[PDB]
């Protein structure tokens, strides 16, 4: 995706926001620069963009940088973005949370169950060229009381799990209506 | 109830500070344990009280693993 960025220098960080610009900063192993996108733009952009796909930032310098949001400072007191990090990539491999499309109708939901889903995304070491829109999750044979771990992931070529080789991914928990309400109210 | 109780304050802690002229024997710092260690021209008593052994100026020296020391640099 594209995004119209600008250079920052002395503009009052707070007074800036009132205008309509979201503070932010781009940087990498060699770079560091005060920037500031636009709220409305960044919003609709980052809505889908999030932090799985890359976004090139067009500075007035005509420079097209292959950045991605390494971190965002969400403002407490009614959610809203305060500030934005921008990690500039190159060619050396870089870790990052890649999406995960859980696909299938697990045995769990059949016997009336719940779509549990731990890591809705997973960090993985990977070359900048590799931009997997997502990763297939073969969740289907999963029955109630069962779970799926990292050591059981389908990894695309040229990628590795930069996590723990045992971490969970999803599960299948029960409902919780009448049986629990009547029983719990007395057994407690 | 059964609570209203407390031993009166002991008023410990740093008594003298760095860059302060001191006579011979002035209690430099009273302390609970070894929150501060002795050092150059600085002795200590049963209660871990740090006190000058010479005349001069106090100085504090942090040393990570070793701990915090306090000494007096003599001069006249």
């Amino acid at each position: 995706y594209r995004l119209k960025a600008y250079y920052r220098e002395g503009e009052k960080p707070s007074a800036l926001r009132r205008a309509g610009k979201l503070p932010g900063v781009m940087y990498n192993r060699h770079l560091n620069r005060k920037v500031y996108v636009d709220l409305v733009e960044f919003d609709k952009v980052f809505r889908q963009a999030s932090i799985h796909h890359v976004i090139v930032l067009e500075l007035p310098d005509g420079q097209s940088l292959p950045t991605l949001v390494r971190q965002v400072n969400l403002d407490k007191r009614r959610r809203r973005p305060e500030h934005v990090d921008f990690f500039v990539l190159s060619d050396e491999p870089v870790e990052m949370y890649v999406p995960l499309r859980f696909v299938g109708t697990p045995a769990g939901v059949r016997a009336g169950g719940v779509l549990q889903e731990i890591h809705r995304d997973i960090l993985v070491k990977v070359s900048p060229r590799n931009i997997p829109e997502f990763i297939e999750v073969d969740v289907s044979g999963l029955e109630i009381g069962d779970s799926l771990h990292a050591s059981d992931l389908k990894l695309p070529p040229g990628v590795e799990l930069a996590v723990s080789p045992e971490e969970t991914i999803a599960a299948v928990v029960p409902p919780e209506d009448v049986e629990k309400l009547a029983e719990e109210a007395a057994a407690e | 109830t059964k609570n209203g109780r407390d031993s009166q304050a002991k008023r410990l802690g740093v008594k003298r500070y760095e860059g302060q002229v001191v006579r011979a024997g002035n209690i430099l710092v009273r302390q609970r344990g070894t929150r501060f260690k002795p050092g150059k021209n600085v002795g200590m008593g049963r209660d871990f009280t740090l006190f000058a052994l010479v005349d001069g100026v106090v100085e504090f020296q942090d040393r990570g693993r070793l701990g915090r020391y306090v000494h007096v640099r003599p001069l006249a």
């Binding site: 980052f46 809505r47 999030s50 932090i51 799985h52 991605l68 949001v69 390494r70 971190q71 965002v72 969400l74 407490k76 007191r77 009614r78 959610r79 973005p81 990690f87 870089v94 870790e95 990052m96 949370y97 009336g112 719940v114 779509l115 549990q116 889903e117 995304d121 960090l123 928990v173 409902p175 919780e176 209506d177 009448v178 629990k180 309400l181 | 109830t1 609570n3």
Partner: protein, 136 residues
């Protein structure tokens, strides 16, 4: 629980740490105002939640009452309150996420959470999900 008897009152300053981000489930419930949330208030909400949608998905309660609520037996001034009358409460500041549902429709959640709102003292809002996390 388990720990020990009685605790200070304390004041509810800024809505700082009181507040987070939908960390589980699809939809969530967020506090707009500070307050002590009672154990009965939580239970009242939880039950009203599930009871709304029978055999529902999963309901996450991220807040948790650990503050003993002190209170005197209608007399005067001898010692500290016996307390415990209302049991316990949770220091809920504005922005905090009390409840969040999962494995269910958007209508069921939008209604259920709406319901579990009236069960609470505070004026509240319902958040969807977005994508606001912390990654790259």
């Amino acid at each position: 629980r388990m720990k020990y008897r009685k605790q200070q009152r304390g004041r509810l300053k800024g809505a700082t740490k009181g507040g987070d981000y939908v960390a589980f489930g699809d939809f969530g419930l967020v506090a707009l105002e500070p307050a002590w949330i009672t154990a009965q208030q939580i239970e009242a909400a939880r039950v009203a939640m599930v009871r709304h949608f029978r055999r529902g998905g999963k309901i996450f309660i991220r807040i948790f009452p650990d503050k003993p609520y002190t209170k005197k037996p209608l007399e005067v001034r001898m010692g500290k309150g016996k307390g415990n009358v209302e049991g316990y409460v949770a220091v809920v500041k504005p922005g905090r996420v009390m409840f969040e549902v999962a494995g269910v429709t958007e209508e069921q959640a939008m209604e259920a959470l709406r319901i579990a709102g009236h069960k609470l003292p505070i004026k509240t809002k319902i958040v969807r999900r977005d994508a606001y996390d912390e990654a790259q």
